[PDB]
Amino acid sequence: TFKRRNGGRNKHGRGHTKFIRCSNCGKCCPKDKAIKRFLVRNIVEQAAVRDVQEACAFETYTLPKLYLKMQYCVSCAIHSKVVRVRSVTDRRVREPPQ
Amino acid sequence: VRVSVLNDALKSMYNAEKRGKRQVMIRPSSKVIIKFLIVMQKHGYIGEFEYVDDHRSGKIVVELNGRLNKCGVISPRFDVGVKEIEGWTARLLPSRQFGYIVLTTSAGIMDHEEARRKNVGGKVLGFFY
Amino acid sequence: TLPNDVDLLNPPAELEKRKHKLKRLVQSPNSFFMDVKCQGCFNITTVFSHSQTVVVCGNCQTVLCQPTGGRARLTEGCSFRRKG
Amino acid sequence: GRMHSRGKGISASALPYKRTPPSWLKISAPDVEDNICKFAKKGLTPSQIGVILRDSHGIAQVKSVTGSKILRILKAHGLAPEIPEDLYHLIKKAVAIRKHLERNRKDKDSKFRLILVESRIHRLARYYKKTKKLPPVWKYESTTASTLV
Amino acid sequence: GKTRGMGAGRKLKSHRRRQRWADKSYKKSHLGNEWKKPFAGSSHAKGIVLEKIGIEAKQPNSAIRKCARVQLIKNGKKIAAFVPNDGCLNYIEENDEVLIAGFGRKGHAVGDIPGVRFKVVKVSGVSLLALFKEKKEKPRS
RNA sequence: UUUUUUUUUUUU
RNA sequence: GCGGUAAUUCCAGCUCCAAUAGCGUAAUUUAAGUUGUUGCAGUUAAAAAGCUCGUAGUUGGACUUUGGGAUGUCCCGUUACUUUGAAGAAAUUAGAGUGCUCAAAGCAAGCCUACGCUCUGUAUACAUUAGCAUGGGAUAACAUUAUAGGAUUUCGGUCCUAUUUCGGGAUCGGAGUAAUGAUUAACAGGGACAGUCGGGGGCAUUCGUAUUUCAUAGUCAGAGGUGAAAUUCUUGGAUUUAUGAAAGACGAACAACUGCGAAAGCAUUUGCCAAGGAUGUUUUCAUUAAUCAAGAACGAAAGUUGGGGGCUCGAAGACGAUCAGAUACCGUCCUAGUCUCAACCAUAAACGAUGCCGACCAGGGAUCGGCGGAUGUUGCUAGGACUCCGCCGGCACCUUAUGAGAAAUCAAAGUUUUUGGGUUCCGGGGGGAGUAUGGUCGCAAGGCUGAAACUUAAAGGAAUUGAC
RNA sequence: GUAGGAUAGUGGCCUACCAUGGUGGUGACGGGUGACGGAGAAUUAGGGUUCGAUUCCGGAGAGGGAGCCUGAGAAACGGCUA
Ligand SMILES: [K+]
Ligand SMILES: [K+]
Ligand SMILES: [K+]
Ligand SMILES: [K+]
Ligand SMILES: [K+]
Ligand SMILES: [K+]
Ligand SMILES: [K+]
Ligand SMILES: [K+]
Ligand SMILES: [K+]
Ligand SMILES: [K+]
Ligand SMILES: [K+]
Ligand SMILES: [K+]
Ligand SMILES: [K+]
Ligand SMILES: [K+]
Ligand SMILES: [K+]
Ligand SMILES: [K+]
Ligand SMILES: [K+]
Ligand SMILES: [K+]
Ligand SMILES: [K+]
Ligand SMILES: [K+]
Ligand SMILES: [Mg+2]
Ligand SMILES: [Mg+2]
Ligand SMILES: [Mg+2]
Ligand SMILES: [Mg+2]
Ligand SMILES: [Mg+2]
Ligand SMILES: [Mg+2]
Ligand SMILES: [Mg+2]
Ligand SMILES: [Mg+2]
Ligand SMILES: [Mg+2]
Ligand SMILES: [Mg+2]
Ligand SMILES: [Mg+2]
Ligand SMILES: [Mg+2]
Ligand SMILES: [Mg+2]
Ligand SMILES: [Mg+2]
Ligand SMILES: [Mg+2]
Ligand SMILES: [Mg+2]
Ligand SMILES: [Mg+2]
Ligand SMILES: [Mg+2]
Ligand SMILES: [Mg+2]
Ligand SMILES: [Mg+2]
Ligand SMILES: [Mg+2]
Ligand SMILES: [Mg+2]
Ligand SMILES: [Mg+2]
Ligand SMILES: [Mg+2]
Ligand SMILES: [Mg+2]
Ligand SMILES: [Mg+2]
Ligand SMILES: [Mg+2]
Ligand SMILES: [Mg+2]
Ligand SMILES: [Mg+2]
Ligand SMILES: [Mg+2]
Ligand SMILES: [Mg+2]
Ligand SMILES: [Mg+2]
Ligand SMILES: [Mg+2]
Ligand SMILES: [Zn+2]
């Protein structure tokens, strides 16, 4: 039985797509199929923001940000709970969670 | 490619009648198509049809009465003698009380009852009911 | 528009114009000819609306139109009148 | 659709329903034939002649004024080429592709396109032999194709 | 789709001829392999009893089905033939003459008896049915 | 994300 | 499926059931729309060649004389096909007649007893294809057309023949007659042209951090790796830090339910070489086309031969762990390989598990390319970017059933018992088996083609409930 | 194809000379048949599937080949010769 119209990937009008390496396990996975997330978070966690600001060596200074593009294979994504198993009707929803 | 303009026309009319459209477009036109339409109109399965000239094969616009259950082409055009008309009618028509099989004979394009009346055979073109 | 709300033999002119040139009831081109005159020369030349060649006025040796993907682009000085 | 591809484009010309010349046109049929013959002598193919006439002389359709096609006029005046224009262009394309392949042996795409072009050439040549536009002895040979043009 | 050309009768006939071989029954009846089988296309065959054997019944049944190893006189092929009815193996002896018939499934095993396609009809010219019902007596010699 | 093998035939 | 100590199923008694002077048991037809031309299937049940070209074969757009007056009749090259006729042994089959006592049969036979009669009857029909003859000229097949060497009237010169100057020929020219002789240009196809577009292809040529190694310099005790460790490297300075050099791979982020290509596949810049779809076109030819045995081009990864390279990773192999064992999963070091060139190999879940061409068939919003129109801005140079309305083509998506389906689902997997647009391939319960054998290709690995004996009642697809 | 021989007669049926022709994916050639062919038999919506040694018609054979006399007629076998 076929359970996904797209076949679990995002290839249309295309022969082959080069793979990426899972950021967790390193498994090869087609890029159009890998679960991709973009994390933009302060380098200093909110707990240490106050201490770092107090220890700042300049009159004013904006703390930088860390940008990370995580590309997970299906197994790693499910295990780490980046994605979860959804109902038959719910898995057709493509909009991101609020 | 386009092989049977008569088949294309009959399929267009059949689909349009199923959908309930009052008018249907046939392109390209042909004298065989016109004779088939005249045969249907004689028995009242279609309304008026108008031929549009475009310095090409032409076009036809046919009004649909709503009485046409199904019209179709028979391919290849098998040879039908005067004695095979009964078998062909049994194969193709829903009943012996109504329905027509169109044949092209040396006497012209006509329905199977007229072919039987004139004792003329030919080749089957299609059917309608 | 609903098929039953229109007549296939008497389509509205707006719909006929909007339709593709080959899909109209009777095929008709969207192109036309034009009488083009330069800015200074009284000579008048016939030019196709979709000219594929650089038409040049014989008198002053000036380009009237420039071929493009569709309609030819006339020079700024020159002007045109629809001929037909 | 396309003979040697999956393209389904329908772009083409839409001839007007009116077969008569426009009123504003004043040139005469013999003048049009003379111009066509002059262009042919200058070395313009029928398609080029038609394009030039439409774009410059305002002759939308040569048949409308003359009553006959450009190739027919050229043949009547003994100016038609030995081989038809389309076959000539196809042979030119094949020769160019072969010249490129002579130096690019890794261009398997060029090899594929050459195969397609020669198939088209052979089909067109067969049709022209059937219609007697080419002598029965005519044969397209890759080795000496450059000589024919 | 099917070929429908009015001039495609040859192609249709040849395609049907090629595809008929996919039919197991047609292939069985037209490959000419019936003559290499023990009966060689016959309903019955006479043979000599070589040995009494017991064949374990297939699951889920449990029993010892009684059969005889019979050598066919006309070609010397060795087969296994079931002996039906209760205690009918007692009427069979080594070097006896037995008539052998099919098991009813046209060369295939029947019931829980594995690899047996034949049965014994007569022994020493007397029907096993008659022997079972005591209508006749097995010849002494 | 340490490790976790196995369950006689028929029948209910 | 019955039989395991309460057997409607075995062995027996009784009773009952079917047929009946018949009944049981062991190639072939039907059922079988499970061989499908009528009339089957190929997304998941068995199934569409990895992709394209292409000869045989099959198939192939439109167009040429209609109408009235009247009354079968008057007026304005070769075939397929169809109608009719002749002929086409009996027997058999269908069928007319006939009380062999009926019947299967047979061709008998009936009145009245007349020194007889019914001329007694012993009909008729059927008969593929192929052949002969005849009426029709719709639908189709092949050939032909325009370099006039064309049709026709008359007349001049040349070449030969017969019935009683003449008739018949066979050529060469003059003159005239004529509406003088060419359908259109398919929302078929090919070709030309114009501005474009693309991560399509080949060659050459710039750039990038990172990895490893090396060189210089600084510091000292751990570094590495794991679930935890160990193998391993480390005061001859490991790991870490800065600068620089070399080598070979790889082209992140941008990057998408986006693009190009026949498929495989294709992502750094710039240059060159050819190639291509779509769009626009009042340009050209005029059926040149669709699909395809045989035959050909390309064809991931791995693999083969020989060079060049050999950073990284890494089959084989060797160790350290875990374990009852662990020839593994985890870790450490590594050969072939991974890259490129020349020559082979031709196979993948080579997938959309879904051939190609053509027609019709609901709605909607996005998006890529081109084009047409309108409109207002731009730290810009009529244009470009954005906004809005449309057309064509393309990758897709959402809703819906009036459709289909075993459903899952499908806007094509629809227009199918109301069955027929053209065309290629291919399946016939499950195994044996993609095996044996033969042939062919390959250096090899293996590829292509491809059985049978025998075995078996299921295997299998979709979906429901529970259990896990 | 030409000319002859032979035959009851036509014909590469055979002889001499001459020419290179003849068939074939519209399947030649080769192989299998537990293959004599037909009239017909079985089953019957229609289309079809299977069978046809056997009394009627045509062909061939007389254990396997070959040759031949007689005769209008035989390559005969309830004729002969090897
Ligand atoms: K799938
Ligand atoms: K995904
Ligand atoms: K194509
Ligand atoms: K175009
Ligand atoms: K058992
Ligand atoms: K049992
Ligand atoms: K049991
Ligand atoms: K007991
Ligand atoms: K008991
Ligand atoms: K029972
Ligand atoms: K290496
Ligand atoms: K263990
Ligand atoms: K290794
Ligand atoms: K290979
Ligand atoms: K797939
Ligand atoms: K669109
Ligand atoms: K003779
Ligand atoms: K001769
Ligand atoms: K025979
Ligand atoms: K005699
Ligand atoms: Mg599943
Ligand atoms: Mg792929
Ligand atoms: Mg094609
Ligand atoms: Mg199209
Ligand atoms: Mg165990
Ligand atoms: Mg009991
Ligand atoms: Mg009992
Ligand atoms: Mg089936
Ligand atoms: Mg499966
Ligand atoms: Mg399957
Ligand atoms: Mg496949
Ligand atoms: Mg092939
Ligand atoms: Mg036609
Ligand atoms: Mg056209
Ligand atoms: Mg460094
Ligand atoms: Mg980049
Ligand atoms: Mg892009
Ligand atoms: Mg090497
Ligand atoms: Mg390593
Ligand atoms: Mg390699
Ligand atoms: Mg394969
Ligand atoms: Mg756009
Ligand atoms: Mg099978
Ligand atoms: Mg002779
Ligand atoms: Mg025989
Ligand atoms: Mg017989
Ligand atoms: Mg007998
Ligand atoms: Mg006989
Ligand atoms: Mg004889
Ligand atoms: Mg004998
Ligand atoms: Mg003898
Ligand atoms: Mg004899
Ligand atoms: Mg005799
Ligand atoms: Zn992973």
Side-chain angles (χ1 to χ4, degrees), chain D residues 1-5 120 123:
Chain D
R2 299 278 77 82
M3 189 212 275
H4 283 162
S5 72
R120 255 175 273 141
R123 285 163 81 165

PDB file of all heavy atoms in Angstrom, chain D residues 1-5 120 123, chain G residues 53-54 189-190 289-290:
ATOM      1  N   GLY D   1       2.409  16.261 -31.447  1.00  0.00           N
ATOM      2  CA  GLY D   1       3.559  16.890 -30.739  1.00  0.00           C
ATOM      3  C   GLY D   1       4.822  16.908 -31.577  1.00  0.00           C
ATOM      4  O   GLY D   1       4.798  16.566 -32.758  1.00  0.00           O
ATOM      5  N   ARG D   2       5.930  17.311 -30.962  1.00  0.00           N
ATOM      6  CA  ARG D   2       7.198  17.368 -31.671  1.00  0.00           C
ATOM      7  C   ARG D   2       7.622  15.972 -32.116  1.00  0.00           C
ATOM      8  O   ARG D   2       7.378  14.974 -31.432  1.00  0.00           O
ATOM      9  CB  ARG D   2       8.278  17.985 -30.782  1.00  0.00           C
ATOM     10  CG  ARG D   2       7.986  19.414 -30.342  1.00  0.00           C
ATOM     11  CD  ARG D   2       8.359  20.429 -31.414  1.00  0.00           C
ATOM     12  NE  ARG D   2       7.375  20.475 -32.490  1.00  0.00           N
ATOM     13  CZ  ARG D   2       6.234  21.150 -32.436  1.00  0.00           C
ATOM     14  NH1 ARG D   2       5.895  21.855 -31.369  1.00  0.00           N
ATOM     15  NH2 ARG D   2       5.410  21.113 -33.479  1.00  0.00           N
ATOM     16  N   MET D   3       8.260  15.908 -33.286  1.00  0.00           N
ATOM     17  CA  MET D   3       8.669  14.618 -33.833  1.00  0.00           C
ATOM     18  C   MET D   3       9.741  13.959 -32.972  1.00  0.00           C
ATOM     19  O   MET D   3       9.664  12.757 -32.693  1.00  0.00           O
ATOM     20  CB  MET D   3       9.168  14.795 -35.267  1.00  0.00           C
ATOM     21  CG  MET D   3       9.422  13.489 -36.004  1.00  0.00           C
ATOM     22  SD  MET D   3      10.776  13.605 -37.187  1.00  0.00           S
ATOM     23  CE  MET D   3       9.914  14.244 -38.619  1.00  0.00           C
ATOM     24  N   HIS D   4      10.745  14.723 -32.543  1.00  0.00           N
ATOM     25  CA  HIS D   4      11.892  14.187 -31.820  1.00  0.00           C
ATOM     26  C   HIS D   4      12.063  14.867 -30.465  1.00  0.00           C
ATOM     27  O   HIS D   4      13.172  15.219 -30.060  1.00  0.00           O
ATOM     28  CB  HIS D   4      13.166  14.322 -32.651  1.00  0.00           C
ATOM     29  CG  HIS D   4      13.283  13.309 -33.747  1.00  0.00           C
ATOM     30  ND1 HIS D   4      14.134  13.468 -34.819  1.00  0.00           N
ATOM     31  CD2 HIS D   4      12.652  12.127 -33.942  1.00  0.00           C
ATOM     32  CE1 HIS D   4      14.026  12.427 -35.624  1.00  0.00           C
ATOM     33  NE2 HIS D   4      13.133  11.598 -35.115  1.00  0.00           N
ATOM     34  N   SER D   5      10.962  15.054 -29.749  1.00  0.00           N
ATOM     35  CA  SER D   5      10.991  15.576 -28.386  1.00  0.00           C
ATOM     36  C   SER D   5       9.588  15.425 -27.812  1.00  0.00           C
ATOM     37  O   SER D   5       8.662  14.975 -28.495  1.00  0.00           O
ATOM     38  CB  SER D   5      11.463  17.032 -28.345  1.00  0.00           C
ATOM     39  OG  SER D   5      10.475  17.909 -28.854  1.00  0.00           O
ATOM     40  N   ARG D 120      15.877  12.599 -39.249  1.00  0.00           N
ATOM     41  CA  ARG D 120      15.000  13.557 -39.917  1.00  0.00           C
ATOM     42  C   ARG D 120      15.410  13.750 -41.373  1.00  0.00           C
ATOM     43  O   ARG D 120      14.557  13.804 -42.270  1.00  0.00           O
ATOM     44  CB  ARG D 120      15.022  14.895 -39.179  1.00  0.00           C
ATOM     45  CG  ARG D 120      13.777  15.180 -38.356  1.00  0.00           C
ATOM     46  CD  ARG D 120      13.933  16.467 -37.563  1.00  0.00           C
ATOM     47  NE  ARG D 120      14.577  16.232 -36.276  1.00  0.00           N
ATOM     48  CZ  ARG D 120      15.463  17.042 -35.711  1.00  0.00           C
ATOM     49  NH1 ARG D 120      15.832  18.177 -36.282  1.00  0.00           N
ATOM     50  NH2 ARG D 120      15.993  16.703 -34.540  1.00  0.00           N
ATOM     51  N   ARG D 123      14.302  10.711 -43.470  1.00  0.00           N
ATOM     52  CA  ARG D 123      12.861  10.688 -43.711  1.00  0.00           C
ATOM     53  C   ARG D 123      12.457  11.734 -44.748  1.00  0.00           C
ATOM     54  O   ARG D 123      11.677  11.447 -45.669  1.00  0.00           O
ATOM     55  CB  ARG D 123      12.109  10.903 -42.398  1.00  0.00           C
ATOM     56  CG  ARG D 123      12.118   9.680 -41.490  1.00  0.00           C
ATOM     57  CD  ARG D 123      11.753  10.023 -40.055  1.00  0.00           C
ATOM     58  NE  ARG D 123      10.314  10.148 -39.867  1.00  0.00           N
ATOM     59  CZ  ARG D 123       9.708  10.164 -38.686  1.00  0.00           C
ATOM     60  NH1 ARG D 123      10.389  10.055 -37.557  1.00  0.00           N
ATOM     61  NH2 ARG D 123       8.386  10.291 -38.638  1.00  0.00           N
TER      62      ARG D 123
ATOM     63  P     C G  53      12.033   8.467 -30.181  1.00  0.00           P
ATOM     64  OP1   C G  53      11.281   9.620 -30.734  1.00  0.00           O
ATOM     65  OP2   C G  53      11.295   7.250 -29.764  1.00  0.00           O
ATOM     66  O5'   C G  53      13.131   8.031 -31.251  1.00  0.00           O
ATOM     67  C5'   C G  53      14.027   8.980 -31.810  1.00  0.00           C
ATOM     68  C4'   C G  53      15.079   8.319 -32.666  1.00  0.00           C
ATOM     69  O4'   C G  53      15.791   7.323 -31.893  1.00  0.00           O
ATOM     70  C3'   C G  53      14.576   7.557 -33.883  1.00  0.00           C
ATOM     71  O3'   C G  53      14.328   8.409 -34.988  1.00  0.00           O
ATOM     72  C2'   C G  53      15.692   6.550 -34.144  1.00  0.00           C
ATOM     73  O2'   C G  53      16.737   7.129 -34.910  1.00  0.00           O
ATOM     74  C1'   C G  53      16.208   6.267 -32.731  1.00  0.00           C
ATOM     75  N1    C G  53      15.739   4.981 -32.163  1.00  0.00           N
ATOM     76  C2    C G  53      16.152   3.779 -32.746  1.00  0.00           C
ATOM     77  O2    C G  53      16.865   3.826 -33.754  1.00  0.00           O
ATOM     78  N3    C G  53      15.743   2.607 -32.205  1.00  0.00           N
ATOM     79  C4    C G  53      14.972   2.605 -31.117  1.00  0.00           C
ATOM     80  N4    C G  53      14.593   1.429 -30.614  1.00  0.00           N
ATOM     81  C5    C G  53      14.552   3.812 -30.495  1.00  0.00           C
ATOM     82  C6    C G  53      14.960   4.962 -31.041  1.00  0.00           C
ATOM     83  P     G G  54      13.080   8.139 -35.960  1.00  0.00           P
ATOM     84  OP1   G G  54      13.102   9.163 -37.033  1.00  0.00           O
ATOM     85  OP2   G G  54      11.872   7.986 -35.115  1.00  0.00           O
ATOM     86  O5'   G G  54      13.401   6.725 -36.617  1.00  0.00           O
ATOM     87  C5'   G G  54      14.550   6.530 -37.430  1.00  0.00           C
ATOM     88  C4'   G G  54      14.738   5.070 -37.752  1.00  0.00           C
ATOM     89  O4'   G G  54      15.136   4.360 -36.553  1.00  0.00           O
ATOM     90  C3'   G G  54      13.487   4.349 -38.233  1.00  0.00           C
ATOM     91  O3'   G G  54      13.300   4.492 -39.631  1.00  0.00           O
ATOM     92  C2'   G G  54      13.716   2.909 -37.788  1.00  0.00           C
ATOM     93  O2'   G G  54      14.511   2.197 -38.726  1.00  0.00           O
ATOM     94  C1'   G G  54      14.514   3.098 -36.497  1.00  0.00           C
ATOM     95  N9    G G  54      13.686   3.055 -35.276  1.00  0.00           N
ATOM     96  C8    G G  54      13.200   4.147 -34.599  1.00  0.00           C
ATOM     97  N7    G G  54      12.524   3.836 -33.531  1.00  0.00           N
ATOM     98  C5    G G  54      12.570   2.451 -33.490  1.00  0.00           C
ATOM     99  C6    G G  54      12.007   1.550 -32.551  1.00  0.00           C
ATOM    100  O6    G G  54      11.339   1.800 -31.543  1.00  0.00           O
ATOM    101  N1    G G  54      12.290   0.231 -32.880  1.00  0.00           N
ATOM    102  C2    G G  54      13.020  -0.168 -33.968  1.00  0.00           C
ATOM    103  N2    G G  54      13.174  -1.490 -34.104  1.00  0.00           N
ATOM    104  N3    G G  54      13.552   0.661 -34.854  1.00  0.00           N
ATOM    105  C4    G G  54      13.289   1.950 -34.556  1.00  0.00           C
ATOM    106  P     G G 189       1.989  19.346 -34.716  1.00  0.00           P
ATOM    107  OP1   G G 189       2.422  19.045 -33.329  1.00  0.00           O
ATOM    108  OP2   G G 189       1.714  20.751 -35.107  1.00  0.00           O
ATOM    109  O5'   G G 189       3.081  18.759 -35.714  1.00  0.00           O
ATOM    110  C5'   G G 189       3.400  17.375 -35.713  1.00  0.00           C
ATOM    111  C4'   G G 189       4.225  16.993 -36.915  1.00  0.00           C
ATOM    112  O4'   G G 189       3.435  17.139 -38.128  1.00  0.00           O
ATOM    113  C3'   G G 189       5.456  17.845 -37.179  1.00  0.00           C
ATOM    114  O3'   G G 189       6.563  17.515 -36.360  1.00  0.00           O
ATOM    115  C2'   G G 189       5.689  17.622 -38.664  1.00  0.00           C
ATOM    116  O2'   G G 189       6.286  16.358 -38.910  1.00  0.00           O
ATOM    117  C1'   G G 189       4.252  17.608 -39.181  1.00  0.00           C
ATOM    118  N9    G G 189       3.822  18.973 -39.529  1.00  0.00           N
ATOM    119  C8    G G 189       3.006  19.793 -38.792  1.00  0.00           C
ATOM    120  N7    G G 189       2.829  20.962 -39.340  1.00  0.00           N
ATOM    121  C5    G G 189       3.584  20.911 -40.503  1.00  0.00           C
ATOM    122  C6    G G 189       3.781  21.887 -41.510  1.00  0.00           C
ATOM    123  O6    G G 189       3.310  23.026 -41.570  1.00  0.00           O
ATOM    124  N1    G G 189       4.623  21.424 -42.515  1.00  0.00           N
ATOM    125  C2    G G 189       5.204  20.179 -42.553  1.00  0.00           C
ATOM    126  N2    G G 189       5.988  19.913 -43.608  1.00  0.00           N
ATOM    127  N3    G G 189       5.025  19.260 -41.618  1.00  0.00           N
ATOM    128  C4    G G 189       4.211  19.692 -40.632  1.00  0.00           C
ATOM    129  P     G G 190       7.555  18.670 -35.848  1.00  0.00           P
ATOM    130  OP1   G G 190       8.375  18.113 -34.745  1.00  0.00           O
ATOM    131  OP2   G G 190       6.757  19.899 -35.612  1.00  0.00           O
ATOM    132  O5'   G G 190       8.509  18.936 -37.097  1.00  0.00           O
ATOM    133  C5'   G G 190       9.270  17.878 -37.658  1.00  0.00           C
ATOM    134  C4'   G G 190       9.802  18.224 -39.028  1.00  0.00           C
ATOM    135  O4'   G G 190       8.705  18.491 -39.942  1.00  0.00           O
ATOM    136  C3'   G G 190      10.665  19.471 -39.126  1.00  0.00           C
ATOM    137  O3'   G G 190      11.994  19.273 -38.679  1.00  0.00           O
ATOM    138  C2'   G G 190      10.561  19.817 -40.605  1.00  0.00           C
ATOM    139  O2'   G G 190      11.409  18.989 -41.389  1.00  0.00           O
ATOM    140  C1'   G G 190       9.101  19.460 -40.894  1.00  0.00           C
ATOM    141  N9    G G 190       8.230  20.641 -40.772  1.00  0.00           N
ATOM    142  C8    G G 190       7.257  20.890 -39.835  1.00  0.00           C
ATOM    143  N7    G G 190       6.674  22.046 -39.999  1.00  0.00           N
ATOM    144  C5    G G 190       7.302  22.597 -41.107  1.00  0.00           C
ATOM    145  C6    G G 190       7.102  23.839 -41.766  1.00  0.00           C
ATOM    146  O6    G G 190       6.297  24.737 -41.492  1.00  0.00           O
ATOM    147  N1    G G 190       7.960  23.992 -42.849  1.00  0.00           N
ATOM    148  C2    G G 190       8.893  23.069 -43.249  1.00  0.00           C
ATOM    149  N2    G G 190       9.629  23.398 -44.320  1.00  0.00           N
ATOM    150  N3    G G 190       9.090  21.909 -42.646  1.00  0.00           N
ATOM    151  C4    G G 190       8.266  21.742 -41.592  1.00  0.00           C
ATOM    152  P     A G 289       7.765  12.472 -41.763  1.00  0.00           P
ATOM    153  OP1   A G 289       8.224  13.883 -41.772  1.00  0.00           O
ATOM    154  OP2   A G 289       8.728  11.401 -41.409  1.00  0.00           O
ATOM    155  O5'   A G 289       6.520  12.359 -40.779  1.00  0.00           O
ATOM    156  C5'   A G 289       5.788  13.512 -40.391  1.00  0.00           C
ATOM    157  C4'   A G 289       4.481  13.138 -39.741  1.00  0.00           C
ATOM    158  O4'   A G 289       3.570  12.611 -40.742  1.00  0.00           O
ATOM    159  C3'   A G 289       4.557  12.042 -38.690  1.00  0.00           C
ATOM    160  O3'   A G 289       4.963  12.521 -37.419  1.00  0.00           O
ATOM    161  C2'   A G 289       3.149  11.464 -38.706  1.00  0.00           C
ATOM    162  O2'   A G 289       2.251  12.270 -37.956  1.00  0.00           O
ATOM    163  C1'   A G 289       2.795  11.568 -40.189  1.00  0.00           C
ATOM    164  N9    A G 289       3.098  10.326 -40.923  1.00  0.00           N
ATOM    165  C8    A G 289       4.080  10.131 -41.861  1.00  0.00           C
ATOM    166  N7    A G 289       4.110   8.916 -42.349  1.00  0.00           N
ATOM    167  C5    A G 289       3.076   8.268 -41.688  1.00  0.00           C
ATOM    168  C6    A G 289       2.588   6.953 -41.758  1.00  0.00           C
ATOM    169  N6    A G 289       3.098   6.018 -42.561  1.00  0.00           N
ATOM    170  N1    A G 289       1.544   6.628 -40.966  1.00  0.00           N
ATOM    171  C2    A G 289       1.033   7.567 -40.162  1.00  0.00           C
ATOM    172  N3    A G 289       1.405   8.834 -40.006  1.00  0.00           N
ATOM    173  C4    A G 289       2.443   9.125 -40.807  1.00  0.00           C
ATOM    174  P     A G 290       5.603  11.515 -36.343  1.00  0.00           P
ATOM    175  OP1   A G 290       6.018  12.303 -35.156  1.00  0.00           O
ATOM    176  OP2   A G 290       6.598  10.664 -37.041  1.00  0.00           O
ATOM    177  O5'   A G 290       4.386  10.585 -35.916  1.00  0.00           O
ATOM    178  C5'   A G 290       3.359  11.063 -35.058  1.00  0.00           C
ATOM    179  C4'   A G 290       2.581   9.920 -34.461  1.00  0.00           C
ATOM    180  O4'   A G 290       1.824   9.257 -35.502  1.00  0.00           O
ATOM    181  C3'   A G 290       3.423   8.816 -33.838  1.00  0.00           C
ATOM    182  O3'   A G 290       3.773   9.109 -32.497  1.00  0.00           O
ATOM    183  C2'   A G 290       2.544   7.579 -33.982  1.00  0.00           C
ATOM    184  O2'   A G 290       1.581   7.511 -32.939  1.00  0.00           O
ATOM    185  C1'   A G 290       1.817   7.862 -35.294  1.00  0.00           C
ATOM    186  N9    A G 290       2.429   7.226 -36.475  1.00  0.00           N
ATOM    187  C8    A G 290       3.312   7.795 -37.357  1.00  0.00           C
ATOM    188  N7    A G 290       3.654   7.008 -38.346  1.00  0.00           N
ATOM    189  C5    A G 290       2.934   5.849 -38.109  1.00  0.00           C
ATOM    190  C6    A G 290       2.854   4.629 -38.801  1.00  0.00           C
ATOM    191  N6    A G 290       3.534   4.365 -39.919  1.00  0.00           N
ATOM    192  N1    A G 290       2.041   3.676 -38.299  1.00  0.00           N
ATOM    193  C2    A G 290       1.356   3.938 -37.179  1.00  0.00           C
ATOM    194  N3    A G 290       1.348   5.044 -36.441  1.00  0.00           N
ATOM    195  C4    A G 290       2.166   5.971 -36.965  1.00  0.00           C
TER     196        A G 290
END
